[PDB]
Design an enzyme around this catalytic site. Structure first.
Site, PDB file in Angstrom:
ATOM      1  N   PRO A  69       0.819  -1.224   0.000  1.00 24.29           N
ATOM      2  CA  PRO A  69       0.000   0.000   0.000  1.00 24.29           C
ATOM      3  C   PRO A  69       0.850   1.270   0.000  1.00 24.29           C
ATOM      4  O   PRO A  69       0.771   2.106   0.907  1.00 24.29           O
ATOM      5  CB  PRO A  69      -0.817  -0.159   1.287  1.00 24.29           C
ATOM      6  CG  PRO A  69       0.098  -0.899   2.208  1.00 24.29           C
ATOM      7  CD  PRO A  69       0.979  -1.782   1.355  1.00 24.29           C
ATOM      8  N   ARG A  70       1.666   1.425  -1.039  1.00 23.99           N
ATOM      9  CA  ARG A  70       2.615   2.524  -1.116  1.00 23.99           C
ATOM     10  C   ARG A  70       3.059   2.697  -2.559  1.00 23.99           C
ATOM     11  O   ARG A  70       2.883   1.805  -3.394  1.00 23.99           O
ATOM     12  CB  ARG A  70       3.831   2.270  -0.220  1.00 23.99           C
ATOM     13  CG  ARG A  70       4.500   0.932  -0.492  1.00 23.99           C
ATOM     14  CD  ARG A  70       5.911   0.888   0.054  1.00 23.99           C
ATOM     15  NE  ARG A  70       6.532  -0.417  -0.136  1.00 23.99           N
ATOM     16  CZ  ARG A  70       7.446  -0.685  -1.057  1.00 23.99           C
ATOM     17  NH1 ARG A  70       7.876   0.243  -1.895  1.00 23.99           N
ATOM     18  NH2 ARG A  70       7.941  -1.917  -1.140  1.00 23.99           N
ATOM     19  N   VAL A  71       3.639   3.863  -2.843  1.00 25.83           N
ATOM     20  CA  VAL A  71       4.363   4.042  -4.093  1.00 25.83           C
ATOM     21  C   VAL A  71       5.674   3.267  -4.012  1.00 25.83           C
ATOM     22  O   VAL A  71       6.369   3.282  -2.987  1.00 25.83           O
ATOM     23  CB  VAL A  71       4.576   5.540  -4.387  1.00 25.83           C
ATOM     24  CG1 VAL A  71       5.257   6.255  -3.222  1.00 25.83           C
ATOM     25  CG2 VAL A  71       5.358   5.740  -5.681  1.00 25.83           C
TER      26      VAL A  71
END
Ligand code: ACO
Ligand code: ADP
Ligand code: MG
Ligand code: MG
Lengths: 472, 95, 191, 95
Positions: C9-11
């Site tokens: 859940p991140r770039v």
């Protein structure tokens, strides 16, 4: 057959051809004058040789015999001249092809039909390309007055050989053409000897459109796309964009097809650029550049086609579609838009005179949508007045033109060159302008806008603090 | 046997001349190979530069191979630190 | 047969090649979504079938791991740094400038370089050109290992697996580098 | 009248405090403005650094603005050349 290539140029374009040749698996040979001994391109090649010993370091790169001798001694199969210097020199092409070396460029017939604008205009009119009305061939001062009388005013004085502020004056009132003719002829005989001038019907607020042309020896001629270079200062380009976002796509397609039909008529090979002047859905031929331009990078970015690699492989005599892999003319894509800004040492606070001195700071940006083609701009480099003012050309590309504009603004604010004055504040002012962002900028956009020359005060506090600390 | 042992020591396959030189002068050849790994081909330097090093603000050119010339300029010799190391401010190939 | 294993859940680090092949600024769109803006109304991203695939891209992470030392992260002083450029080359540099002292505190990454082209073979060739043009001296890098992986025919075909590195011992054979400038400067300083 | 005269000399529109400072001490204010253009705000420096400069291998921090702190280190002082100029090898912001 081709395994080693010499570059008869310097600076950024030599590094560009070195990168293309290394990607193509070829060995590279550099040449350099004594005063260019700290240039980056000298150490970017497998072999480097001193040329033009004892000469001024502009004649060393124009020394045809020394470059030929170095190419023969190093065993270089081919010679790439880049742009400028001997790129459009026909004598250099004759000696390169006579010595047995492949010349990365168009044929010699293309060289003399596009070395002067009179024969280029002749080929344009017999190719049914709509040119600009003007005098036919070599006219004298009385012919200039004759054309000024019957065709009217305003007119533009232009010499056949060269340009770019060399032998290119204007005339809007009587008794101006005489001294304009004298100045243009003096500038012509200063450089290339006696050169004929042709007087042109000047255009109020024109747009400058360049069409990039790629053609092989098999006769396949494709245009990648066109680029807009109308942002000009004293008729010298400063910022180039691609594609022409201020023009409708069908008009740009028609201009590209006209350039394609002209290059097909002359049987053009390798890479070349057809320049146009554009006003209210009517384009006029001006000249053909028989080489690669400084602003080919935006065409590469919006088309995805490596122009320098393609022209090396065309000099290897390969077919554009089967061998290179370039698709059909309709299958050439349009990958958004791109903007090229050339960062030079021209100080806009001092009339754009090129600054010299040592560069003590150099920081370059990066990230998404940024292309850098650096020349000699590293920290510790001493800028000499011998060569061109260019430090590094930077290209920003994006899907939308506004995103390209904001990326270019971010790049120009992120850029840091201290020690010499740059044209970066002027570029920032041009980027921030509403005409440029809308894309309807003309050739007279800079000269009609005084707000581009107001520069905010920059408090370079690190430099001042270091200066005071050194003083104390 | 000595060829395999020398390849184990010097880190690459030696020629017949290198094996013979290792046989005749075992410690001297290994010290020469260590000096080659540390200082490189110092035979390409000119004799005043080979013997006395480099002066301040001096400009020398070393041809390592054909078409490759090293532009070396000594700009500043730093003062020794507490560890006894000095920083020499060289200008190699413009940088 | 695809199977789910994870969602991050991140770039990610590898968002750059997706940006290059799609033309979509991932970080800019992330910030604009954090501003509560619609993806197609104000950001301007097209619908699903109109997302362009602009060629192929390759990302190489140049770290301080020494493949001749079991990929241990090297430390020390970077005395030389030259970065490449030109067509199809994207650079996302970390802390790799000349004079930077590499510390063992943070990650080993020096610079992320991304190479994009319309054809994957052109991307492989430009990545090889970048890895040969890249010059980081004074600290060890994984650049010869990256060159060995680039030159492998499994990589160029695109049939590499997660066991491709471990099954190939030829990737750990590294040619000797002469490094004549550093040796000459060392000898000159010593004398 | 004196504000328009002062604006030409200092290169920007002066405040009321700058105009009234120019009346009393016209040469001192213009010499202060010239020193502001050459050395900047030296008022932000620490007083030992203000009076004695920097030592060799000394590391100072100058807060020129809120959130902006210059990291300045003097690594080496060069010898004067024939022109009488010294080259100081600073390390500003890591570079
Ligand atoms: C633009 C491009 O495509 S660059 C791609 C790779 N670069 C090239 O092919 C040309 C430059 N070649 C080199 O730098 C090296 O010789 C390489 C890349 C072939 C590898 O050699 P290495 O073992 O790693 O180091 P090498 O023994 O050659 O050191 C010689 C020095 O002379 C430099 N040099 C390289 N070419 C030249 C040249 N034509 N003239 C003068 N100096 C040169 C090298 O940069 C090197 O200095 P460095 O320590 O800063 O790196
Ligand atoms: N008749 C004309 N009317 C308006 N602009 C012109 C005319 N002739 C030349 N120019 C301008 O002069 C510039 C130089 O044109 P050109 O000669 O093709 O390039 P160069 O001078 O570099 O050879 C062009 O950008 C063009 O805008
Ligand atoms: Mg032109
Ligand atoms: Mg995972």
């Amino acid at each position: 057959h081709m395994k080693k290539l010499l570059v008869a140029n310097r600076g950024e374009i030599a590094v560009r051809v070195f990168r293309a040749c290394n990607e193509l698996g070829l060995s590279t040979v550099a040449v350099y004058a004594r005063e260019d001994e700290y240039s980056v391109h000298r150490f970017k090649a497998d072999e480097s040789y001193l040329i033009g010993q004892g000469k001024k370091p502009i004649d060393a790169y124009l020394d045809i015999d020394d470059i030929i001798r170095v190419a023969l001694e190093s065993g270089a199969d081919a010679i790439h001249p880049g742009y400028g210097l001997l790129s459009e020199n026909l004598e250099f092409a004759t000696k390169v092809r006579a010595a047995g070396l492949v010349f990365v460029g168009p044929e010699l017939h293309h060289l003399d039909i596009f070395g002067d604008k009179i024969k280029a205009k002749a080929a344009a009119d017999e190719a049914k390309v709509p040119g600009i009305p003007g005098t036919n061939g070599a006219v004298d001062i009385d012919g200039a007055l004759e054309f000024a009388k019957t065709y009217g005013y305003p007119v533009m004085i232009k010499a056949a050989l060269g340009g770019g502020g060399r032998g290119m004056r204007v005339a809007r009132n009587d008794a101006e053409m005489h001294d304009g003719y004298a100045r243009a002829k003096s500038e012509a005989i200063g450089a290339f000897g006696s050169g004929e001038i042709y007087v042109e019907k000047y255009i109020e607020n024109p747009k400058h459109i360049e069409v990039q042309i790629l053609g092989d020896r098999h006769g396949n001629i494709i245009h990648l796309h066109e680029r807009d270079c109308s942002v000009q200062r004293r008729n010298q380009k400063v910022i180039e964009i691609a594609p022409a976002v201020g023009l409708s796509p069908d008009f740009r397609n028609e201009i590209c097809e006209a350039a394609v039909k002209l290059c097909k008529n002359v049987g053009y090979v390798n890479a070349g650029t057809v320049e146009f002047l554009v006003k209210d859905d009517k384009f006029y031929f001006i000249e053909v550049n028989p080489r690669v331009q400084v602003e080919h990078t935006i065409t590469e970015l919006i088309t995805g086609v490596d122009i320098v690699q393609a022209q090396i492989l065309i000099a290897q005599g390969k077919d554009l579609h089967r061998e290179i892999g370039l698709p059909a003319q309709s299958e050439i894509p349009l990958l958004g838009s791109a903007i090229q800004c050339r960062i030079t040492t021209e100080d806009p606070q001092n009339g754009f005179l090129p600054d010299t001195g040592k560069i003590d700071t150099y920081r370059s940006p990066g990230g998404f949508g940024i292309r850098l083609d650096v020349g000699n701009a590293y920290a510790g480099y001493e800028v000499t007045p011998y060569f061109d003012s260019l430090l590094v050309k930077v290209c920003t590309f994006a899907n939308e033109f506004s995103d390209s504009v904001r990326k270019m603004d971010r790049v120009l604010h992120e850029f840091r060159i201290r020690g010499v004055k740059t044209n970066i504040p002027f570029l920032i002012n041009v980027i921030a302008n509403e005409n440029f962002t809308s894309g309807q900028a003309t050739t007279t956009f800079i000269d009609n806008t005084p707000s581009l020359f107001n520069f905010p005060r920059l408090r370079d506090r690190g430099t001042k603090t270091l200066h005071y600390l050194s003083m104390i | 046997t000595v060829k395999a042992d020398l390849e184990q020591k010097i880190g690459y396959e030696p020629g017949d001349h290198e094996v013979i030189s290792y046989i005749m002068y075992p410690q001297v050849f290994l010290d020469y190979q260590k000096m080659q790994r540390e200082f490189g081909a110092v035979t390409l330097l000119d004799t005043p530069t080979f013997l006395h090093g480099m002066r301040l603000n001096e400009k020398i050119e070393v041809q390592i191979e054909k078409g490759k010339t090293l532009s070396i300029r000594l700009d500043e010799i730093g003062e020794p630190d507490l560890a006894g190391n000095r920083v020499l401010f060289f200008n190699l190939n413009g940088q």
